[PDB]
Design a protein around this motif. Structure first.
Motif, PDB file in Angstrom:
ATOM      1  N   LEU A  31       0.824  -1.204   0.000  1.00 65.48           N
ATOM      2  CA  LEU A  31       0.000   0.000   0.000  1.00 65.48           C
ATOM      3  C   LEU A  31       0.862   1.259   0.000  1.00 65.48           C
ATOM      4  CD1 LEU A  31      -3.104   1.061   0.492  1.00 65.48           C
ATOM      5  CD2 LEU A  31      -2.272   1.365   2.819  1.00 65.48           C
ATOM      6  N   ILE A  32       1.890   1.297   0.849  1.00 66.36           N
ATOM      7  CA  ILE A  32       2.656   2.524   1.050  1.00 66.36           C
ATOM      8  C   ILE A  32       3.470   2.889  -0.187  1.00 66.36           C
ATOM      9  CG2 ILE A  32       4.673   3.408   2.283  1.00 66.36           C
ATOM     10  CD1 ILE A  32       3.422   2.013   4.804  1.00 66.36           C
ATOM     11  N   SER A  33       3.788   1.919  -1.045  1.00 64.45           N
ATOM     12  CA  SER A  33       4.630   2.205  -2.200  1.00 64.45           C
ATOM     13  C   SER A  33       3.872   2.884  -3.333  1.00 64.45           C
ATOM     14  CB  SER A  33       5.273   0.918  -2.717  1.00 64.45           C
ATOM     15  OG  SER A  33       4.308   0.055  -3.285  1.00 64.45           O
ATOM     16  N   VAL A  34       2.540   2.861  -3.309  1.00 65.84           N
ATOM     17  CA  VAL A  34       1.737   3.539  -4.320  1.00 65.84           C
ATOM     18  C   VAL A  34       1.277   4.879  -3.762  1.00 65.84           C
ATOM     19  CG1 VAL A  34      -0.134   3.282  -5.967  1.00 65.84           C
ATOM     20  CG2 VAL A  34       0.991   1.262  -5.055  1.00 65.84           C
ATOM     21  N   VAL A  35       1.125   4.951  -2.446  1.00 65.13           N
ATOM     22  CA  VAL A  35       0.770   6.185  -1.758  1.00 65.13           C
ATOM     23  C   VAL A  35       2.065   6.884  -1.364  1.00 65.13           C
ATOM     24  CG1 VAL A  35      -0.467   7.189   0.180  1.00 65.13           C
ATOM     25  CG2 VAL A  35      -1.335   5.105  -0.897  1.00 65.13           C
ATOM     26  N   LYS A  36       2.225   8.138  -1.780  1.00 58.46           N
ATOM     27  CA  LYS A  36       3.436   8.887  -1.447  1.00 58.46           C
ATOM     28  C   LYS A  36       3.079  10.370  -1.423  1.00 58.46           C
ATOM     29  CE  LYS A  36       6.187  10.021  -4.558  1.00 58.46           C
ATOM     30  NZ  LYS A  36       7.083  10.330  -5.700  1.00 58.46           N
ATOM     31  N   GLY A  37       2.947  10.924  -0.216  1.00 61.12           N
ATOM     32  CA  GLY A  37       2.560  12.309  -0.018  1.00 61.12           C
ATOM     33  C   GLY A  37       1.205  12.460   0.641  1.00 61.12           C
ATOM     34  N   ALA A  38       0.264  11.570   0.321  1.00 66.73           N
ATOM     35  CA  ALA A  38      -1.045  11.592   0.958  1.00 66.73           C
ATOM     36  C   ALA A  38      -0.982  11.236   2.437  1.00 66.73           C
ATOM     37  CB  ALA A  38      -1.991  10.637   0.234  1.00 66.73           C
ATOM     38  N   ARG A  39       0.149  10.724   2.911  1.00 60.40           N
ATOM     39  CA  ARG A  39       0.349  10.396   4.313  1.00 60.40           C
ATOM     40  C   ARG A  39       1.062  11.529   5.038  1.00 60.40           C
ATOM     41  NH1 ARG A  39       3.956   5.844   5.151  1.00 60.40           N
ATOM     42  NH2 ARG A  39       2.834   5.486   7.109  1.00 60.40           N
ATOM     43  N   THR A  40       0.804  11.629   6.340  1.00 65.23           N
ATOM     44  CA  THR A  40       1.553  12.498   7.234  1.00 65.23           C
ATOM     45  C   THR A  40       2.120  11.665   8.375  1.00 65.23           C
ATOM     46  OG1 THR A  40      -0.448  13.086   8.477  1.00 65.23           O
ATOM     47  CG2 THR A  40       0.208  14.537   6.667  1.00 65.23           C
ATOM     48  N   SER A  41       3.120  12.221   9.059  1.00 62.41           N
ATOM     49  CA  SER A  41       3.799  11.478  10.114  1.00 62.41           C
ATOM     50  C   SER A  41       2.966  11.389  11.385  1.00 62.41           C
ATOM     51  CB  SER A  41       5.152  12.119  10.421  1.00 62.41           C
ATOM     52  OG  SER A  41       6.083  11.851   9.390  1.00 62.41           O
ATOM     53  N   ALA A  42       2.178  12.420  11.690  1.00 59.34           N
ATOM     54  CA  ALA A  42       1.300  12.366  12.851  1.00 59.34           C
ATOM     55  C   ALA A  42       0.207  11.315  12.701  1.00 59.34           C
ATOM     56  CB  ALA A  42       0.670  13.735  13.094  1.00 59.34           C
ATOM     57  N   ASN A  43      -0.129  10.934  11.469  1.00 56.27           N
ATOM     58  CA  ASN A  43      -1.173   9.951  11.205  1.00 56.27           C
ATOM     59  C   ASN A  43      -0.608   8.772  10.424  1.00 56.27           C
ATOM     60  OD1 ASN A  43      -3.673  11.202  12.305  1.00 56.27           O
ATOM     61  ND2 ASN A  43      -3.167  12.817  10.836  1.00 56.27           N
ATOM     62  N   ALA A  44       0.535   8.253  10.860  1.00 59.10           N
ATOM     63  CA  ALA A  44       1.246   7.219  10.120  1.00 59.10           C
ATOM     64  C   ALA A  44       0.657   5.827  10.307  1.00 59.10           C
ATOM     65  CB  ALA A  44       2.718   7.206  10.532  1.00 59.10           C
ATOM     66  N   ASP A  45      -0.422   5.678  11.075  1.00 61.59           N
ATOM     67  CA  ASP A  45      -0.986   4.369  11.369  1.00 61.59           C
ATOM     68  C   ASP A  45      -2.417   4.191  10.883  1.00 61.59           C
ATOM     69  OD1 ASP A  45      -1.851   6.285  13.114  1.00 61.59           O
ATOM     70  OD2 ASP A  45      -1.344   5.195  14.947  1.00 61.59           O
ATOM     71  N   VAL A  46      -3.019   5.202  10.262  1.00 61.81           N
ATOM     72  CA  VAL A  46      -4.398   5.139   9.792  1.00 61.81           C
ATOM     73  C   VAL A  46      -4.456   5.670   8.366  1.00 61.81           C
ATOM     74  CG1 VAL A  46      -5.180   7.430  10.484  1.00 61.81           C
ATOM     75  CG2 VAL A  46      -6.788   5.511  10.504  1.00 61.81           C
ATOM     76  N   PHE A  47      -5.280   5.037   7.531  1.00 61.80           N
ATOM     77  CA  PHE A  47      -5.444   5.437   6.140  1.00 61.80           C
ATOM     78  C   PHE A  47      -6.910   5.318   5.752  1.00 61.80           C
ATOM     79  CE2 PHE A  47      -4.457   5.211   1.486  1.00 61.80           C
ATOM     80  CZ  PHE A  47      -3.767   6.402   1.430  1.00 61.80           C
ATOM     81  N   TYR A  48      -7.336   6.167   4.815  1.00 61.02           N
ATOM     82  CA  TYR A  48      -8.723   6.235   4.376  1.00 61.02           C
ATOM     83  C   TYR A  48      -8.813   6.114   2.863  1.00 61.02           C
ATOM     84  CZ  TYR A  48      -9.674   8.036   9.051  1.00 61.02           C
ATOM     85  OH  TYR A  48      -9.768   8.191  10.413  1.00 61.02           O
ATOM     86  N   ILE A  49      -9.840   5.407   2.395  1.00 60.52           N
ATOM     87  CA  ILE A  49     -10.173   5.318   0.977  1.00 60.52           C
ATOM     88  C   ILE A  49     -11.666   5.582   0.842  1.00 60.52           C
ATOM     89  CG2 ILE A  49     -10.222   3.881  -1.085  1.00 60.52           C
ATOM     90  CD1 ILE A  49      -7.886   2.286   0.252  1.00 60.52           C
ATOM     91  N   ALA A  50     -12.022   6.615   0.081  1.00 58.29           N
ATOM     92  CA  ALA A  50     -13.384   7.120   0.031  1.00 58.29           C
ATOM     93  C   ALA A  50     -13.924   7.121  -1.394  1.00 58.29           C
ATOM     94  CB  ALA A  50     -13.464   8.538   0.606  1.00 58.29           C
ATOM     95  N   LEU A  51     -15.252   7.084  -1.485  1.00 57.44           N
ATOM     96  CA  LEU A  51     -15.989   7.139  -2.739  1.00 57.44           C
ATOM     97  C   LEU A  51     -17.092   8.178  -2.606  1.00 57.44           C
ATOM     98  CD1 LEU A  51     -17.484   4.226  -4.824  1.00 57.44           C
ATOM     99  CD2 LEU A  51     -19.009   5.906  -3.791  1.00 57.44           C
TER     100      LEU A  51
END
Lengths: 158, 221, 158, 221
Positions: A89-109
């Motif tokens: 997951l992390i290798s396709v996402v680059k920039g959409a993450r922040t360090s304060a929220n490095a343990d949670v991710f969201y995918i929305a429609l």
């Protein structure tokens, strides 16, 4: 690493539903209509051959096309060190993450109906913060999210 | 000859090859062998000094949906480290927009230009690098940057290492040691004619004569 | 205002064909296979319900998926002052035009096969200069080119 | 009252309405009536002075696939005239990248900032505008810019015209006269308290007391 939750609004017979998840999930009950619509919502979020089409007027709750369809999925990235799917997951996402929220991710429609063209367009976003999501990039018919998830659908009939 | 002992080796490698040896051929062969062997999600990065070599390698390799980076080492940092993770290290005020005249002789003025002027800075002295020191600064302040770099690439191919500053060496060694990413270094010791651009030949020679975790080969063809 | 030309390369039984056009066009002949593939190429370029799918391995010339499919259409914008379709095109295009080339426009299609995923992705570009084209912007399933052209397909059968 | 004589009028209009008149209500009603009446490909542009009014109008109007511009007059130029057509007027060296501290007192230095620094310029004197003079300069040098502006919009809605500089007046009058685009102007003559930002109340009063192709109405509700 782990699925956590899913929220569905104004989609078919769902109005506002919040369901906690895990990696293995079993759904049962007597409705038999919400059970199929649950899997359809999952396919719309994660399946490109279903999302390839749009949303009809019958896909909106109460057939009221003046409301917005939202489907949001949550993940947990706590085991980056011990898991290799977190890296996928992390290798396709680059920039959409922040360090304060490095343990949670969201995918929305999100979908809003077009009354003139009679079409419901689907637009996808991810982000670590739920109040700051951005469009998933892609070229042509392909998406950056299609590079990660492979959805296998099994049904004895059709 | 030794050209068959390289394709069979996986890890840190040097190739002390002179002019006319055929560096591009062996580099492309090794890249193709590594890509064919591996069946994971990881990729490779090929860093050069000119756009001509980058385009030659791009044309030779072909087309794939696997995300591999082929280009110049100046584009590597901008594309992978600085532009995506500049605001995660310093703050939301620092911009990720830039189109690079405005060079100075201080590091702080570089950040000032990038922020207020909204254009990438430079240095007047060619013995110091602004890009490759900012990149290393960002890598040490952003956890998501290091996570992405580790999750993305499994090997990095570097050529013409003799014409490398101290900042380039620092960044590459940080990647090799702290992040545990393999390296493939090719260079000619006696081709430092680019010293007018701040090249330091001492780095390649020191690696050759002191490295213990590097496998060393020489090409006479 | 006016259709001018179309070029097709490495698509089905077309290898390199250049055809001059007008607003009204009639195609006839004894091949009966190239005649249908001509209209299919037009649909792929201008029809979103056909382009919505990709290109198969049988869509490439000689089934050699190592070649690139190119379909390029040319228009003439000389009657901007007297025509209202030129304005319909120009109002969606903004920046892709230059003043030195204010009378010619290009719409192109490109596809390269993915051997690992077994898929042919289609990416569209326009521009005034044929050596400088840029991707047509869009969100979700919709394209900026879909806002202009309406393709009506008529067939007595199916 | 006269609120029914406005919705039935198509062309150039003024509405000299004071505080508490309900400018937003009539503006939204006119916008909706114009959009419902017209069945062509053309759109409208609503220009305000604050993001709050822009968002209020955006929420009131609703959602459509027709491309209408609702926002501030500073965003209008950046989105429609400058960013797309800056390189078509001057040259390919002028950049279309910007994220707007770096204000100066000359137009040429503004161009120099935009080019070398790669950030939008400003002026130290609030009586002169850099954005709305650059926009008019571009409009007179690019044929495709004028073509797009004419092909895109059929009416432009302007509110709070009393707080407008001379450059804003120049650009709007150029659009009205040379490009033949209708205008809808709403403003309170006695609300020029923003004169500290270079506002010129003389423009609205001159339009009221001298215009011959403008239809004038006053609201007392």
């Amino acid at each position: 690493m782990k699925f956590s939750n899913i929220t569905i609004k104004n989609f078919r017979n769902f109005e506002k539903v919040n369901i906690n998840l895990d990696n293995k999930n079993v759904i049962f009950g007597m409705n038999d209509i919400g059970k199929t619509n649950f899997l359809y919502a999952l396919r719309f979020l994660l399946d490109k051959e279903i999302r390839k089409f749009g949303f009809n007027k019958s896909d909106y709750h109460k057939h009221d096309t003046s409301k917005k369809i939202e489907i949001i999925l949550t993940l947990d990235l706590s085991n980056y060190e011990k898991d290799e799917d977190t890296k996928k997951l992390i290798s396709v996402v680059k920039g959409a993450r922040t360090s304060a929220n490095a343990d949670v991710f969201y995918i929305a429609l999100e979908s809003k109906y077009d009354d003139k063209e009679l079409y419901g367009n689907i637009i996808l976003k991810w982000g670590s913060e739920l109040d700051n999501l951005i469009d998933i990039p892609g070229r042509g018919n392909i998406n950056a999210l299609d590079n990660v998830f492979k959805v296998i659908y099994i049904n004895p009939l059709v | 000859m030794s050209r068959e002992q390289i394709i069979k080796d996986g890890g840190n490698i040097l190739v002390t090859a002179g002019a006319g040896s055929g560096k591009t051929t062996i580099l492309v062969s090794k890249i193709e062998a590594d890509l064919k062997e591996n069946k994971t999600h990881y990729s490779i990065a090929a860093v050069t000094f000119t756009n001509k070599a980058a385009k030659e390698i791009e044309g030779r390799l072909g087309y794939s949906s696997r995300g591999n980076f082929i280009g110049t080492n100046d584009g590597f940092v901008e594309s992978e480290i600085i532009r995506p993770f500049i605001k995660d290290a310093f703050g939301n005020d620092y911009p990720d927009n830039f189109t690079a005249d405005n060079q100075f002789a201080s590091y702080d003025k570089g950040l000032q230009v990038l922020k207020y002027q909204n254009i990438l800075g430079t240095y007047s002295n060619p013995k110091k690098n602004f890009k490759f020191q900012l990149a290393l600064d960002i890598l040490k302040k952003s956890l998501v940057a290091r996570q992405y770099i580790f999750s993305k690439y499994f090997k990095i191919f570097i050529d013409e290492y003799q014409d490398s500053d101290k900042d380039m060496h620092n960044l590459f060694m940080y990647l090799k040691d702290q992040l545990k990413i393999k390296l493939f270094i090719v260079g000619d010791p006696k081709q430092s004619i680019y010293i007018w651009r701040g090249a330091e030949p001492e780095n390649f020679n020191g690696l050759i004569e002191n490295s213990t975790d590097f496998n060393k080969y020489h090409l006479t063809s």
